[model samples]
Target: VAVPKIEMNFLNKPIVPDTTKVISNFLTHYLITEPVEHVEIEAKLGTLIDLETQNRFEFPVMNETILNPEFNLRTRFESDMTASEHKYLNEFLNQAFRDSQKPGRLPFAYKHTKQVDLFYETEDKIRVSKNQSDNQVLACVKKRRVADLFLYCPNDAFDIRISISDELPVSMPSGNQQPSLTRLKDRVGYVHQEIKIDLTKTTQNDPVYDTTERHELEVEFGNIADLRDRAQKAKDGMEAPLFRRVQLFMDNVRILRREHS
Candidate 1:
C-alpha cells in the first residue's frame, strides 16, 4: 500500500487564539458565584487567569491537549482507522481461506485473555508483575522493562505500553542584588493497553470460523499499523484548517509571526 504523505503546511501555520474563552469564562464565573471568601476568590482568580491566558495561545495548548497524552487523546482518535484496517485484513483472510478450499479448518489455535498493567513509571523502575512468577521472566527480557504487558490466551502473549515525558528548566539571576533561584521539572507519563482473544467459539463447519483465529491475528497487527498512520493524519487535519484560519486572521489584524511567537 502507498503511504500517505502528510502536507507540512499545517505545522507552519498559526493557530486561533482564545478559542476556549467561553469555557474559561464559564469556569471563572462558576467559581466566583460559589460561597467562597475573599482569599479564595483571589486565589481562584489568579489560577484561572493563568489557565485562561495559557489557553488563549494556540500552538502549545493545541499540541499538549490533542497530541501529548499517548492514550486518551491520541489513541482514541486513531482507533477508528485501526478498526477499518482490521476489517480489511479479516475480509482478505476470509477470501483467501475460501479460495484454498480448506472450508472448515484453521491454521492456528486462537484464544484471548484480559491484560492489565501500570501506565507510567519514574526514573528506570519497572512495574511489579501481577504474577510473581512472571517477574523473573520479565527481568530476563531486555526490552520488556519499559513496555506494557499484553495477555493473550492463558500463557501466551506480548507486552506493550506507551511512554511520555516533558522537561522544564530552571534559571538563576546572575549578579543580582538579591539572587533568586528558578526551578524546573519534568513530568513522565505512561498508559497500558490489553489484548484479549476468545477461543470458545468454533469454526467447526463454517469456513469463516475455521480460519477466524489466523485472520483475527493478522487483522490485529494490520490495525496497529493503521492506528499509527491515522493518529498522525488526524493531528495534521486538526491543525491544518485552524492554522489557515490563523493566517487569515493574522493578515487581517496586521500581526507578524515575530510578534506572535
Candidate 2:
C-alpha cells in the first residue's frame, strides 16, 4: 500500500490587551462571535514555537514528497486523512467548551495546528520513486490546524504577576525636620509563552488521563512587577512606578484536518 502525501499551513497572532477591561470585552466577543468550527480550542499561554515576544507568527507552507509515484492514489489518501483530522479536532473542542461553564473571565486563549507524515517500505530493496525524487522519500507531508481561545481577566493578570512579590509595604512617617515620605504604587507586567495540546487521536471512550499525566498543553504567562518603594530607592527624584507593558493573546485559531467529517 502506498502512503499518502500531505501538506499543511498555519497562521498565528498575539492578542494584545492594554487594560483589564479589554480582557472582559474580548471574552464576550469570543464566546459570542468566535464560535468553534472544524477545530479544537485550547487555553494556552502563548504561541506554539516561540513565545518570547508579542508578534504575529505564521508557519511555512508544507509540501509532500512521494517516493511511490502513484500521484492520484497518494493525493486521495492524503486528502482523506487531512479531512478526518480536521473534523475530529473541531468536534473535540466544541464538546470541551460546551461542557465548560461560562466564566466571568478567562486566563488565556489558545489554538493548535498539526501535521502528519506517513512512510512505508517496499518488498524490493529499491524504494519506489516519485517525481524523480529519492525512492527513500516515501510519503512525507503535514496536516495543519489551529484552535483559539483567550486568557480571561483578573485571574490571568494575577497569574502573570504572582512571582513579583508576596508582600506590599507600608509608608513610615518622616520627622517634621526630615523630608516627607512619598507613597508609591506597585507595577506589574505580563507576557505569554508557548503551549501545546494533542487531541488528534484522542477518543471519548479513552480514560481522561488526569492523575500523573500533564495536559498536552499548559498555558503559562510570564510576569514582572516593580515595587514603587524599590524603584524610588534606586533614584532620588523618581516618584512613581513605571508599569509600561501590554498583554498579548492568540488570534485566528483553526484546525488543519477533518477526521470526523
Candidate 3:
C-alpha cells in the first residue's frame, strides 16, 4: 500500500515538494499536482468501534508493519437504515449490494459498517485528478461481481477480509456512469505493540458445549494480559528492533490444545 521516496533519479537530490504550496499541502491539495485529500476526525467520524472488545485482538505484523493506505468510500449506517438513505450514496454503493450475486451483507456483522468498495483504472481513466501530474487511479468498477466479507469462526479468532478497491471520483453522483467514491483513505499514524500470534488461526476448545463461547471469553482475557506485556516493551517510537521484540513475545496464548493430548 506504499512506497519510499528518493529523488536520486540516480544522481539527483531526493525528490520532494520544493514549493510552499506543495509543501504546505501535505495530505490534501498540491500547488502543482491535481489535488490531495484529507479529513479531520472532527467527532471521531461516526460511531466509534468498541475498543474494549476489539482491543483483545492483534495481528502477526510488527508494530511498524504498515501497509499503504488503500482507498475506500465508507458510508456507515445502523440497522434502521432505509432504501432512500442508500439512494443518496448511490455514487459509492450503486445499489450493487442489491444486485450482488455473492454480495456481502449491508449492515456488516461485526460493527455494521455499510461500505461499498469499488475501483478505477486506466480503462476507466477519463482524466487525471487535479492532484498528480502523470496518470494513476487503480481500476474503474464498470464490471460487476460479488464477494463474502467479514466472515468469522470462534474463540474470538479466525477472521479474514478481502477487497479490490481503487479510486474513482469524489463528486456527486451522475446518472449511473462511473462511481468514483472517495473522501476517505488510510495513512501512517499510531503504531501499536508487536504481535506474535498467527492471525489466521486460533487455538481454543472447539467442542460442542464449552467451545468457542468459553474459549473466546478466555482468549479475550488472555489477549488483554498480553497487551499489557506488549505495551511494556521498549520505546514506543515505532521501534527498529523489528522481529527481535516480536519474537520474544511469541505465543503467550491464553487458550490452546490440551497439553498431553
Candidate 4:
C-alpha cells in the first residue's frame, strides 16, 4: 500500500473568538457617551402679522365652539424626513454597522427593524400574536432600582399585561377578567421608541442635518440567563440574534463624545 503525505500548518496567530463583544461594547458605549444632535422643526400656526405696523398680533383664543378653548396644543410630531435625508440617515447607520467590523469597534447579534411600530395593536385593543417565532421583548425597569426582564418564547403562545416606572409585573391587572396563560404551542413580541430632536430653527433655507444614530437592544428571553452565562464564558458564547429596531424620526441631529469617569 502506498502512503500519502499530508502537510498541516497550525495558525501562527492566536484564534480570537470574542469578535462581536468588542463591537457590542463599542456600539453601546458610542450611544451612551455621545452627545445628542438637534434639528429645527416647523409647525404651521397660521398667519398673525399686521401689515400696517409690520408686527405680529397674537390670537387671544381659537375660533368659538362654546367650550373652554384650551386646546391640547401639546402634540408629538415625529419629524418627517425628506427622502434624501432618510436615505442619508440610514446609510449613516449602515456605515456605523460596517465600521463595527473595523479594528476596535464592537457589535451585536443585530437585526435591523424597518417599520417603527410592532404590528399587533388593533381597534379593539385585543392583540393576537401570530407569525411570531423566536420573538423577544425586553422590559428594563429603572425606577426604584434598575433591572431587566425579558419576555421570550419560541413557537409558543404567551399572553401578557404590562407598564412602567412603578413595578410593571408581567401579569393580569387586579380588576377585569384576568389575562390567561396557556401552554398550547403557538406564537411570539413591545418596545416603544421615540427619538425626539427639535426641528424648530432651520426652516427658511435648506436645512442642515447632522448625521445621527442610536441603538436599542431586544432579546429572545426564554433562556436569557443561559445566554448571559454563555456570554460570560471566556470562549463559549453564542452570537445570540437580536432585533435592532431603528426608530428614525429625523430632521437633523448630532453626536458628541463624552469623557468616561
Candidate 5:
C-alpha cells in the first residue's frame, strides 16, 4: 500500500534541544500510559528476508494487560498512496486471509503458538512465536538471536525478552497440486518483531513514532551482522530506514494529489 510515514538521542535525550522520547509516542498515543521499555542482548534476525534494506519488522500491537502480548509473527507492508490505495491494500491483506475459510493456494492452517519469550535484564530486561496444532506443544525456551531497533523515555522501567515462533502458512492457492517450499516462503506467514530500549543513546532504535499509516518489515538476521555499524549510523542523525521510506512515500502521494488537482 502507499503508506506515508513518519526519533531522538543524547546521553539518551540531552542533545535534541528537546528530549523527545519520541519513541514512546506510539505507546502513549495508542497504549495511553507508555510501553514497558525493553532490550534484547542476544536478539538475531530471522531468515525469511534476503535483502538488507528489506529486513525491517515490528508489531502492529495494542495494549492488553489481560490478554497475552503478541507472541506471533507479523509481516508488515508499507507504501505511499491515496485514500483509495490505502483502502485497496487494506482489502488486499484482509482478502489474502479470507480465502482460508474455503481453502486457497495452500490449505490455510490456523493453530496455536509454540512461542516463548525469554527476558533478560542484567536492570535491563527484554521479549516469539511458533505455531502448534492438535494437542501437542513443546514447552521450551528455544535459543535464537534477533536484531532490533528502538528507544525509551525517562522514568520507564526496562524489559528484556526473546520470542520464538513457528511458521504459520499464508500462501494463496494457485491449485490443489501445491507449490514447493519456495512459493509458500515468498509471503511469510509468521511475524517476528523486536523492539529494544536502553538508557544510553548508544541504543539503535529510532523512528520512534505513533503513526497512522501501515508498515512492513522482513526478517534477515545477517543484515545486522555489524550491530556496531548500525548503531553508529543511527547516532549520526541519518534518516531512519523505516521512517524515511514511509516519509518519501507520503511525500510522493501528496505530490500526485496536487498534480491530479
Candidate 6:
C-alpha cells in the first residue's frame, strides 16, 4: 500500500516591497551629475581560486620552501590585508584641523583619496598558473573564475583655517567665532564584481577535501548612465576579451615531466 502525503491548510504569506530598490536608491543618491565634471570608468581585475583536492600541484614560480606555497596563487587572501592608510590620515587631519584654529594659524591643507567597490551580475576568468618563460610552460591548474571591480575617485582635500572667512564655509560661524574648515568634495566611482561561487564553502583547509559541488554565479546590469552602469560595462568589456583566454588556458594545461627552469 502507498502512503499519501498529508495536506494541511496554511495562511497565505503577504508579499513585501522589493528590497532591490535599495540598490536603485544607492545609485541615485551617490551617482549624481551636479558636481560630476568628469565621469571616468576603470576596473581592477583579480580572482580568488578555491581548488578541489586529489590533484598534484606544482609550479616553477611558486616558492615551495614555505609550508603553504599557495600564497603565490592568490591576489587577496586571509592573511594579506593591509592596514587602512585613510584611517590614520583622517585621524591626523582631524587633529590638525583643531590645532589650526588657535591664535596663530595658517591655511592647513591635506588631500585624501577614496575608493569604493561594487558588485554586479557579470564576471570573467583567468588561469593564473598558465604563464610561460622563454618557451617552457611555467605552471598550470584547473580552477573556477571570478571578477572584481576597483573604483577610484578624484582627490578630496581638507583645507581648513581660521583667518578671514571665505565666500563658502565648511563650518558655519558661531557667536564671536569665524568659520574654521573648508573641505573639498570629489567624484565617486564604483568597483563592481559578480558573485560567482560560495566563498564560504570554498574556504581552504589545511588538508583539502574533494567535492562534487559547483556553483554558478548569475549577474545582470540594467541600463543607467551612472556609476553602476559604467562599472558594469567596464567589467563586461574586460571580461569579453578574457573569457576565451581563460578557457583555452584551462584546457591546455601542460604538465612538464622534468622541472627545468
TM per candidate: 0.19, 0.17, 0.17, 0.24, 0.20, 0.16
What local lDDT does model 3 show for residue 30? Answer: 20
Ranking by lDDT: 5, 2, 4, 3, 6, 1
Candidate 6 TM-score, true structure as reference: 0.16
Two-way lDDT contest, 1 vs 4, winner = 4
Model 6, which residues run further than 4 Å from truth? 1-21, 33-207, 222-261
Please name the candidate that would achieve the greatest lDDT relative to the true structure: 5
Q: What is the alpha-carbon lDDT of model 3 when measured against the actual structure?
A: 0.24
Model 1 regions more than 4 Å off: 1-81, 94-106, 119-122, 125-261
Q: Tens digit of lDDT per residue, candidate 3, span 1-261?
A: 565475558766433322212212221122113321221100010111224453223335433221223423232211111233222323222232334325553321111111223333444333222212233443223332121122111222222221212223444224455634332211111111322111111123433755221111011111323332333332243322322332222222212211111
Per-residue lDDT over 38-133 for candidate 6, one digit per residue giving the tens place of the 0 to 100 score:
222111111122244322222343211111323343323111111232233334445645676577675333333321211112132112121112
- Where does model 4 exceed 4 Å of error? 1-75, 82-84, 113-253, 256-261
Per-candidate count of clashing residue pairs (backbone under 3 Å)? 3, 34, 20, 14, 40, 5
Give the alpha carbon lDDT tens digit for every residue of 139-221 in model 2: 23221223222221221111111001112222222223332121111111111232233333211222475422111222222
Q: How big is the positional error of residue 239 in model 6, measured in Å on the Cα after superposition?
A: 30
Model 4 local distance difference test score? 0.25
1-261 per-residue lDDT for model 1 (tens digits): 774476446675443544232222222232233311111100000001123343211232312121222332212111111224334433443453355455555333222322222222333322221223332321111122111111011111111111111111212212232312111111111111211111111111343544321111211111223333333343455434323422332232121111111
What's the lDDT for residue 19 in model 4?
Answer: 23
Best by TM-score: 4
Residues 34-73 of candidate 4 have per-residue lDDT tens digits of 3111211111111123345543322344321111114432
Give the per-residue lDDT of model 5 (tens digit) for 1-261: 663332243233323211122321221222123212221132111122213356533224331011123533443222223444333433443453466456334433322232222222222212211222333323223233222322111111211122222222222222343212110001223211222111100111225744333222222222232333333444455525433322332232222222211
Q: Supply the TM-score for candidate 5.
A: 0.20
Candidate 1 backbone overlaps, count: 3
